Design a protein around this ligand. Structure first.
Ligand SMILES: CC(C)S[C@@H]1O[C@H](CO)[C@H](O)[C@H](O)[C@H]1O
Ligand SMILES: CC(C)S[C@@H]1O[C@H](CO)[C@H](O)[C@H](O)[C@H]1O
Ligand SMILES: [Mg+2]
Ligand SMILES: [Mg+2]
Ligand SMILES: [Mg+2]
Ligand SMILES: [Mg+2]
Ligand SMILES: [Mg+2]
Ligand SMILES: [Mg+2]
Ligand code: NA
Ligand code: NA
Ligand code: NA
Ligand code: NA
Ligand code: NA
Ligand code: NA
Ligand code: NA
Lengths: 1011, 204, 193
């Protein structure tokens, strides 16, 4: 029948979808959510054999174990066990686009399990098996007899095994196909894997059973009263003595209860549902659920007899909350939300796409600790535990259908085809039937990148009809089609329009006011965090806060989808597209997270945490105004600490308890701040601390911070003229300046400071030269490739302009003797085949104090692409352990991503000045620096810098971080100016104009001296 | 033009039409009809089917049509004749002046139906004036209302021709038969004859 | 697979629906709506045999004509030919309401036709067969090979016979089931045929 090549068949004998069941036979266990003996896990060791195609699977396998088989852990993805390679492709399908057909060479995973089943399970009731996740299609056999078939890799497939099992030993046989017609709807941008990757279990239910139940909560105007409505459905024989009791609990207190026999209200001319009943419970002053305060109640559904005998019980956590769009605003419990979200794929560097509780909790804790209050299930229903954790820890969730046909041409070819409506509908309807009772889920999504088809309109209406308590969104086809309640563009910029034909991405501010538009706008994807990115992140938040209808978005994305491989010595390294022989592939485009695969934070995470702060501050004189962006909670676990320092030197500090009502303000009057004597800039730094531990954070957690420049005292005092006078020694090839124990050497042929001495020690390994390039970041590269160059990408423009090949041509080099110093004057011309790109004019003034003042003035040809940087660089012979600087830190920060960084005195080990991005590039920069210290050296001024053991050349020529080798000495890059990193997206130029080095003429000055 | 979908005998009537498991089968009865007949000028209205209550599958397919063919209104009588799945209030056998307040699915006087709080759609009966045998009494009352009220734009009489079948007796003479005359049981006897004309098209 | 008891399977290898086609190879013919040499009718005398259930149909019927079969006119309803009784019920289904199942005693109509096909039709292009209406479900075979399946009694089911036909004589075998899961969606108040 080749059911895996027929979108008409998505399953055979599969049971109806429903909310999480456990079939408790004890009500107390149901109330407290304790384990159930009726729900058994089949996870553990299974037998597995790999085949090139289903036609190659031997028939004997159905009856007994294949001696060729291996014993492997389940759940798992077989690529992670080395049976075949995982494939990383973004848009292009991993198989030939010829729907509904798949390759004849279809990797087949043969799973089998021999397990015991107690007679008591077969004597009565129904025994079903549950496969929470099988990628991508499979046939099931039990004791040699065919049971069924199932598709959709991200939702559970359940089959009744009651007539197939026998007391004692039993054997299951599962033939999993990597490719199926379902694969045409699973083209998400992630590693393409397969296998039984989610839990497998057996559920026992009585013949007369609770087959489904829906919980809804409505409120009065001020949410002081609510009515909980629970519709319960049963299967089995109807008897007049049957009853259903729904009880609601707050802790160990029962706040409400309702009981009734089956038989719903009349719905039409034929009557009503005799196998259903709806209980309605009134709840006065319910504690409301929100990501701010995840208040939860427990609802227990009991099927029983009138005399009180329990048959079975089910239950769920209930969060009292109302979600609705009113007057163009997405409201929660009547308040306008501000979505601080992120897209999160289910990924593990070691286990692939298998999810575990520990990794989930770690992600949720890191998310809340970094001020995120929402997550988008990009782009498929998640492992069931995920919603339970979100309900309890408090996170707004966008549950998304497992539907993406990105690789089709046009994108909606299948979604606008009625022959694919059936397949698509099951991916939407079964998701809703499974997760509709979770309060964390506040918005339904029809899928991702599948254009806009009539099938979307139909499924949009289906959801609105069955679940009016949640808005429905979908980005495909222009982000504002008739299939979405929310304008949800991906990568729409703040101010810049991107007028693409048919599917334009308007500036978000402009999008809201288009003629006739009234919906709220929330980006389903924005701020693509590939590598050194998130430039311009603050521009989004300034806009979100100023415009009521701009209610936020979900960053793309949470974690790098890198995988682990080992070298010959067993040392692990991070691998990306193409490292497994997978081809074609999309290389590093699988890594766009705010954190590395092992959850180590990327510098960008801190910029997100700061911009997403819940308290806003303003300063006027001695008054600090604290404004709360919380909607429901008072600041009952917040303390404001303030500090005033002069160039990093603390003068005064204190703390004040925060007592701000949600949306409210608090004025804090700072005490008389004593004026400092010494010259310098005074800085005020405030931070909000949470004294007490929470379910998601430890005592002392910092949730917000901000700085302001206070008074500044310009230094006018003249340095006590040192008696010493430097001396110049001139030769044909050099200008040497001696001063006591120090010496400076300027090659007269190159025009650069080629060497320095402190005693008999050389300080340089490479001459101090101008630098106008940087090892390209992911954003500089875009989608450009050697086989497919993107002439528009920054890196390609720089390459074509000769920026990386530019040769320095000495125009002038003179030496003058002053009354108390030596003055070196140089001028260089950087040209590329007749074209002068840059001109550098410098002066070096060495006085008796041993200080070397360098003045640099650069001209950049207006017709050459704006350079990545304007600075100097050299390889220092020294290799010290610490790096001390007075500037923005402590973390890596760039011009368009430095709002989170604070000005102060920072000191870190040299290794922390390097950011280990899997794909190497310019990194570790620190801006707004007035003083830098390393070994015996000190540089002062107003510059940006990065310092490490890797040269820009090596970073540029190395594809993977683990392949980097520390060079001799230390490479120092000091920039007067550095281009922004961009990030609005990573496939087109995204560095905003105000962060491009287009001034034409630049000036910066540095003072180099030995401590 | 109406989709071949009627589940009248289910209890309740929408048991299948509100079940997502049946959405696939239903959608094909609707979509393939539209793909076949959309170029015919005579077809001015699409119908989702008949007597199958009102289920979520109806809302889905209603929207599908509006999306693929905005040139024709979409109607459906199930679930009360004025649900979210119909552009036209299309009751069957709603009377002119007399209300019939059935629970959940009332049949209001058509004059009254039009002005219920918030209602603005036109009203056209998908079925009215049941012509079983000696019938059509009160037919003129309907037309008087149709002509007086702009939004009462008519209706479709039920129905055109008697569904009687021919059988033969001893003398080989043919005679008109109805339910039960073929041993078919259970049956609904003469209820298959409600036309304005006899099976051979002779007028009643 | 008992495809007639699965609302998940409404057809097998059926071609997409579309507006009326005639495939004129002459524009003036298309303009004037005159008969097309590319659209042939297979209406007329066919071979028919009645069986109480699909399990009672002999396999030999796929390869050659059943001598016990009768020659009947098609299109037609077999109740009108007297093979079994037409049923008149209004609301109540004519079969036990147990979706998606139908009675095991499922009247099965076995239709067959020996017809000729011009070689020019097989030397190029695509030759399809169109059943404008089959009540209520059916399987199709051509020259003994299974072609497809289809449901919905009131719309045309089309199948590509290009790879099943030979120049000259060919034999179609059509097994029509009276009841199917499609029957749960066809409870209109009218005679059940
Ligand atoms: C490569 C672009 C043309 S499509 C772009 O690629 C990104 C890679 O992280 C993401 O998958 C986005 O969702 C997708 O739209
Ligand atoms: C028998 C009624 C309660 S239902 C009534 O029966 C009529 C018989 O001609 C028609 O079929 C109507 O459409 C139907 O609603
Ligand atoms: Mg399939
Ligand atoms: Mg995509
Ligand atoms: Mg646990
Ligand atoms: Mg700031
Ligand atoms: Mg079927
Ligand atoms: Mg009816
Ligand atoms: Na809403
Ligand atoms: Na806003
Ligand atoms: Na990606
Ligand atoms: Na507090
Ligand atoms: Na690199
Ligand atoms: Na009128
Ligand atoms: Na009738």
């Amino acid at each position: 029948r080749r059911d895996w090549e027929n979108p008409g068949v998505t399953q055979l004998n599969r049971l109806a979808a429903h909310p999480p069941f456990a079939s408790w036979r004890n009500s107390e266990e149901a109330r407290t959510d304790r384990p159930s003996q009726q729900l058994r896990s089949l996870n553990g060791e299974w037998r597995f054999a790999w085949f090139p195609a289903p036609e190659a699977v031997p028939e004997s396998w159905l009856e007994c174990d294949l001696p060729e088989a291996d014993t492997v852990v389940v759940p798992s993805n077989w690529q992670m066990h080395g049976y075949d390679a995982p494939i990383y492709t973004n848009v292009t399908y991993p198989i030939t686009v010829n729907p509904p057909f798949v390759p004849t060479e279809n990797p087949t995973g043969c799973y089998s399990l021999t397990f015991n089943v107690d007679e008591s399970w077969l004597q009565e009731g129904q025994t079903r098996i549950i496969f929470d996740g099988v990628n991508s299609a499979f046939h099931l056999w039990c004791n040699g007899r065919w049971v069924g078939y199932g598709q959709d890799s991200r939702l559970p497939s359940e089959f009744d095994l009651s007539a197939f099992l026998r007391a004692g030993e039993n054997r299951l046989a599962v033939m999993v196909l990597r490719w199926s017609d379902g694969s045409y709807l699973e083209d998400q941008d992630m590693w393409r894997m397969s296998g039984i990757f989610r839990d497998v279990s057996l559920l026992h239910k009585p013949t007369t059973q609770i087959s489904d139940f829906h919980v809804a909560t409505r409120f009065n105007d001020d949410f002081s009263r609510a009515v909980l409505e629970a519709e319960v459905q049963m299967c089995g024989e109807l008897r007049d003595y049957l009853r259903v009791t729904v009880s609601l609990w707050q802790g160990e207190t029962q706040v409400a209860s309702g009981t009734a026999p089956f038989g719903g209200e009349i719905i039409d001319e034929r009557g009503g549902y005799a196998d259903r009943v709806t209980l309605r419970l009134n709840v006065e002053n319910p504690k409301l659920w929100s990501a701010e305060i995840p208040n939860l109640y427990r609802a227990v559904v009991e099927l029983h007899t009138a005399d009180g005998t329990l048959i079975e019980a089910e239950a769920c956590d209930v969060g009292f909350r109302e979600v609705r769009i009113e007057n163009g605003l997405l409201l929660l419990n009547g308040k306008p939300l501000l979505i601080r979200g992120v897209n999160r794929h289910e990924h593990h560097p070691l286990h692939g796409q298998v999810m575990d509780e520990q990794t989930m909790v770690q992600d949720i804790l890191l998310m809340k600790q970094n001020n995120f209050n929402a997550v988008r299930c990009s782009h498929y229903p998640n492992h069931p535990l995920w919603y339970t954790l979100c309900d309890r820890y408090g996170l707004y969730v966008v549950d998304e259908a497992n539907i993406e046909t990105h690789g089709m041409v046009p994108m909606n070819r299948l979604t606008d085809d009625p022959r694919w409506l059936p397949a698509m509908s099951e991916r939407v309807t079964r998701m809703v039937q499974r997760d509709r009772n979770h309060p964390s889920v506040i918005i339904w999504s029809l899928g991702n990148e599948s254009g806009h088809g009539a099938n979307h309109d139909a499924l949009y209406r289906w959801i609105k009809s069955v679940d009016p308590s949640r808005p429905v969104q979908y980005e495909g086809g222009g982000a504002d089609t008739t299939a979405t309640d929310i304008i949800c563009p991906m990568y729409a910029r703040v101010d810049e329009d991107q007028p693409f034909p048919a599917v334009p991405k308007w500036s978000i501010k402009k999008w809201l006011s288009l003629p006739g538009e009234t919906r709220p706008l929330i980006l389903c994807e924005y701020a693509h965090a590939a590598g050194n990115s998130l430039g311009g992140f603050a521009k989004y938040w300034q806009a979100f806060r100023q415009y009521p209808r701009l209610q936020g978005g979900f960053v793309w994305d949470w974690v790098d989808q890198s995988l682990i491989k080992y070298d010959e010595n067993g040392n692990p390294w991070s691998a990306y597209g193409g490292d497994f022989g997978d081809t074609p592939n999309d290389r590093q485009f699988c890594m766009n997270g705010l954190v590395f695969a092992d959850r180590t934070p990327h510098p960008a995470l801190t910029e997100a945490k700061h911009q997403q702060q819940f308290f806003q501050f303003r300063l006027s004189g001695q008054t600090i105004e604290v404004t709360s962006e919380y909607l429901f909670r008072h600041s009952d676990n917040e303390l404001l600490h303030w500090m005033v320092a002069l160039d990093g030197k603390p003068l005064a500090s204190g703390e004040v308890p925060l007592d701000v009502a949600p949306q409210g303000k608090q004025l804090i009057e700072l005490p008389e701040l004593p004026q400092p004597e010494s010259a310098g800039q005074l800085w005020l730094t405030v931070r909000v601390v949470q004294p007490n531990a929470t379910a998601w954070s430890e005592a002392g957690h910092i949730s917000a911070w901000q700085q302001w420049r206070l008074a500044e005292n310009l230094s006018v005092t003249l340095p006590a003229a040192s008696h010493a006078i430097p001396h110049l020694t001139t030769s044909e090839m050099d200008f040497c300046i001696e001063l006591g124990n120090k010496r400076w050497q300027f090659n007269r042929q190159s025009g650069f400071l080629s060497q320095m001495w402190i005693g008999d020690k050389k300080q340089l390994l490479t001459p101090l030269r101008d630098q106008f390039t940087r090892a390209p970041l992911d954003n500089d590269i875009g989608v450009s490739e050697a086989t497919r160059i993107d002439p528009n990408a920054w890196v390609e423009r720089w390459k074509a302009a000769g920026h990386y090949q530019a040769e320095a041509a000495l125009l002038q080099c003179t030496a003058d003797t002053l009354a108390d110093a030596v003055l070196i004057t140089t001028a260089h011309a950087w040209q590329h085949q007749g074209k002068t790109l840059f001109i550098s004019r410098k002066t070096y003034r060495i006085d008796g104090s041993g200080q070397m003042a360098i003045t640099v003035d650069v001209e950049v040809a207006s017709d050459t692409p704006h350079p990545a940087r304007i600075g100097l660089n050299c390889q220092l012979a020294q290799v010290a352990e610490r790096v001390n600087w007075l500037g923005l830190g402590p973390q890596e920060n760039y011009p368009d991503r430095l709002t989170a960084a604070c000005f102060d005195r920072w000191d870190l080990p040299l290794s922390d000045m390097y950011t280990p991005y899997v794909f190497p590039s310019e990194n570790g920069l620190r801006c707004g620096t007035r003083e830098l210290n390393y070994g015996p050296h000190q540089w002062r001024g107003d510059f940006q810098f990065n310092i490490s053991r890797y040269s820009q050349q090596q970073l540029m020529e190395t594809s993977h971080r683990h392949l980097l080798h520390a060079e001799e000495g230390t490479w120092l890059n000091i920039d007067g100016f550095h281009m922004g990193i961009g990030g609005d997206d990573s496939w087109s130029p995204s560095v905003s104009a105000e962060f491009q080095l287009s001034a034409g003429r630049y000036h910066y000055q540095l003072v180099w001296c030995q401590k």
